[PDB]
Design a protein around this ligand. Structure first.
Ligand SMILES: Nc1ccc(/C=C/c2cc(Br)c(O)c(Br)c2)cc1
Ligand SMILES: Nc1ccc(/C=C/c2cc(Br)c(O)c(Br)c2)cc1
Lengths: 115, 115, 114, 114
């Protein structure tokens, strides 16, 4: 129900081994850790959560773009790329969060489907 | 060896039934029709060409964004989104051309892999 | 030293009257309010800070995109857009944080000049 | 009535000294030269046309991104970036075509205002 895909605009490639952390806003307004993982060789991160676990809420997907760039030997501008959204509030949906990275820029889009 | 994927930034969905035309620059500097098709329900267009057919050259991928938006009842800014690039000049590669559409904007990226 | 510019990809216009908050990362890793305002008719927000006040560190620029889209009657995806970056004195002196908004997407870039 | 602004997503800067050609679509569907120039230190290209000369029709803005990246020693994907649009008198009067460049990607938006 939640997939993250990351691409590299410099190399024209998937962004591999990118760390991703997902948080969910708690009742006390803090960000509770929800799930995390690493993008694969395809730039995709599968298996973050389950339909059971992925309840309604406000979620933050933090993509650790700085660590990615530094590993390639590049000093980038941003610390991370964030995506903050309400999920599943009209029932379960499937979300893909895609991000396209450059050293001084990023872009993100959501693909939301109703199974 | 050549795949086109198109997403809708307004709807948060694949861009379905988007017409795509591919041209190749001829010896006389004109744009020769090469291949064409329509994106599927996934926003993907597969089967445009073959490794045999897809020789070195300068290719133009024209995504008919205006027709897409007009079909949804929207008057968009651009006539089409173009992607013009040299392909296969250091041997066969696999190219994905991805585009993300809004009524007054688009973005495109290439994912190039060496099989 | 810090300007924010916001554009609307749906209407093909500056994004006008958008609330923007800037935070600075504190020692305890919390986000402390630093500066804020609303974009002008040109989509720009000037006068956030001064050379004196804007020191090296980690900053977060939060753009209230959800209110923006609601006010235009358009259904949005994100709660807000965030841009988190380090200000570095060895690079150029003036930072422009630009954002391009769609309902289910946004893009941001930095234009850092002297 | 027509301005072009180009930014560099790799360096976080305006894209300076980039060649830009504008064409207008002719009756025979061919592309006729209309205006051209090079971006300034701010990444902007002003003075392309006048209100008088800029009539409704289909225009193509070609940005020579390949030369730009080559001059910086960076390997590029695209031959050029294109932006093809219709000028419509029922909409606002001033058009800004903005482009954000990376080696394997670009983004473009229109800012159309009165
Ligand atoms: N600017 C901008 C922002 C995001 C994107 C997404 C590309 C994208 C490519 C593949 Br292939 C794919 O499977 C998915 Br899902 C998404 C492109 C351009
Ligand atoms: N993805 C994407 C596409 C386009 C842009 C444009 C940024 C932009 C910056 C400044 Br300063 C300016 O004056 C104008 Br007019 C436009 C940003 C991100």
């Amino acid at each position: 129900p939640l997939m993250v895909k990351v691409l590299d605009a410099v190399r024209g490639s998937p962004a591999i081994n990118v760390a991703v952390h997902v948080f969910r806003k708690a009742a006390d307004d803090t960000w509770e850790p929800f799930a995390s993982g690493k993008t694969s060789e395809s730039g995709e991160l599968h298996g973050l959560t389950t339909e059971e676990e992925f309840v309604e809420g406000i979620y933050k997907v933090e993509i650790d773009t700085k660590s990615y760039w530094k590993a390639l030997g590049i000093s980038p501008f941003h610390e991370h790329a964030e995506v903050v959204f309400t999920a599943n509030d009209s029932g379960p949906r499937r979300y893909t969060i895609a991000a396209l990275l450059s050293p001084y820029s990023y872009s993100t889009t959501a693909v939301v489907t109703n199974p």
